[model samples]
Target: GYVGIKIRLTDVAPQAQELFKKESLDVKENKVYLVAATLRPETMYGQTCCFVSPKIDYGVFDAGNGDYFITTERAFKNMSFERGYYKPLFTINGKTLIGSRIDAPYAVNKNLRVLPMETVLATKGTGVVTCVPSDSPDDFVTTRDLANKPEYYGIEKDWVQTDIVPIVHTEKYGDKCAEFLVNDLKIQSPKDSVQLANAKELAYKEGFYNGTMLIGKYKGDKVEDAAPKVKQDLIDEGLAFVYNE
Candidate 1:
């Protein structure tokens, strides 16, 4: 196992659903569910944008636990048929999709919005993803794209843009990296496998080992210092629930 932690933006998802139901995703038949994994929970305060693959066809599989998941029928079948973790009682796909815009629910003073993107991978973790920019380089760039170019994606421009209210800070990656590599890489695609892979590895290692705090009550603390506090806050607020695979 990779021993990585996955986070849930339980807040923003509901908001996304309302718009998705009307525009990008459909709630008919069965709403497809999308799940994405994150290695950092502390950086949740920095989340900027979410992603879904345009090339892959997805379906919402009834999780049967009073909640729904957005994923591919193939993936949902694997979960229910192969792994047997969940049994989807129903299904929905792109054909049924009536809309794309969505809002995040229960976000902490954040303006989480959902829009269509071609970067998500069906075979990866989950078809749907939430964005966190502080500790994640890919998430940072994608969020910037959405914030600055809403018209390009067909949604309200700058719909998801929010103030850079630092939840906590750390060494190596501070307050986000838009100013670090935007010009260096000329990053045009957040899903570019080779570059993202490199960034992911670097960020994961650096953030885990060298990150320090520049915001929050834990100013000047390391990621190791403030991570648990942030995580516990999420748990306490019920904005996030835990799951294991």
Candidate 2:
């Protein structure tokens, strides 16, 4: 439903590559997938942990043909609400996945671990969070906690003691939130709230009406084309199930 500029991985992370390939894929009764975001598709070099909100209730439901999704009750409700996805066949809240960590394919390696909810948001996009420091302000804070460069945020002692890749860039949001928001003081939580309605208005007008693919295999491809193919890929991979909208 949205564009996730994913850095297609050609290799797995060190810690997870062997383990993920060798570990028997279990057909658990309840499971869920946390959809995290990343700004630096290039700097996947440092990924220590994947985050999940412990308070959010989620489920690992069949996308059909064996694939699954880890998402919140509210997410599922909205999926079915605006689009009508069927009620989930099974459920598992965030409490279950927290301590029970696992390995996954992240960029060029698989060493990243799954850690506790710590301070993630349940209401954000999906209860599932991804750490991307190259662009995300929160991810930089969390990544710093993992690396122990300078302990400024109120992060737990153990969190910063994790693996990470350090890459740098200069763009819209600067190196990190602190550097970029020195004058504006950015709020870290959804409670700070983004101007979504206005964003949608401008986006629909300029983006929807005038936006064109700037580059890629489908450079200049209509956003409409990109969307359908994306949907098709999800459906083809059993990552998505379709219902009439």
Candidate 3:
């Protein structure tokens, strides 16, 4: 199992700010960040959007030093009692964040919208997911589905259609492993649970051991060699942190 990794809280969606302000929540010194727990920090460059379950409950917690994060109540409590200092500042229902946008760290698309994913587990890391369609099979199919039926999901067609940049290159899958596996396996939608699980396993393994960086400062470096370097760079710049579950 993957240990939790801290995603840096950077910019909040302007709409999100309005939501809090409309509710009379404090916003002067607070910078809201959605904590996305992921194992593949190096693949962050390909993030098209962020995901959260519309039905789930989320909160805005104070992460001291004038930073706030949008995540689940459970995570906020965990951080409050055990991790210390970060307190619940306010509550923002997950459903309201659907059409709002968040600025993802290191993403080519600076303003990536927050969309809903049925598969997001409230019990998992912050209940917020980072969409890396290039390497994550789940993200790939989910984005494809959203693009195909924006009306059904209540999102604009352009948001889900954000460009997919090639970040990792593998001998078998070329530059986009998720896209390759989705086509090769004929995986249709986000509901292709079995196929997606298999693809995710394969993509994580291959991309970790054999993949090469096509972008970033580690360009041309093997993933195995560059993953740690990239992660450290993120941490050094306060773009990521270490979080254990």
Q: What is the C-alpha RMSD of each candidate to the true structure, in Å?
A: 5.8, 8.5, 2.8
Better of 1 and 3 by lDDT: 3
Instruction: Encode model 2's per-residue lDDT on 72-186: one tens digit a residue.
Output: 6555555545544545555555544533443432232353444544566666455666554433445544454444522333234564433333233223333332324322453
lDDT of 3 by residue, 121-223 (tens): 7886778888999999999999989888888887889888546889999999979999999999999989878889899999999999999999999989999
Against the hidden true structure, what lDDT does model 3 obtain? Answer: 0.78
- Error in Å for residue 20 of model 1: 9.6
TM-score ranking of the models: 3, 1, 2
Go through the candidates in order and give the clash count of each.
31, 14, 0
Please provide TM-scores, in order, for all candidate models, with all chains considered together: 0.65, 0.49, 0.88
**Stretches > 4 Å off in candidate 3:** 1-18, 22-29, 78-87
Top-TM-score structure, candidate number:
3
List model 1 lDDT by residue over 147-181, tens digit each: 67666655566555545555444344555543344
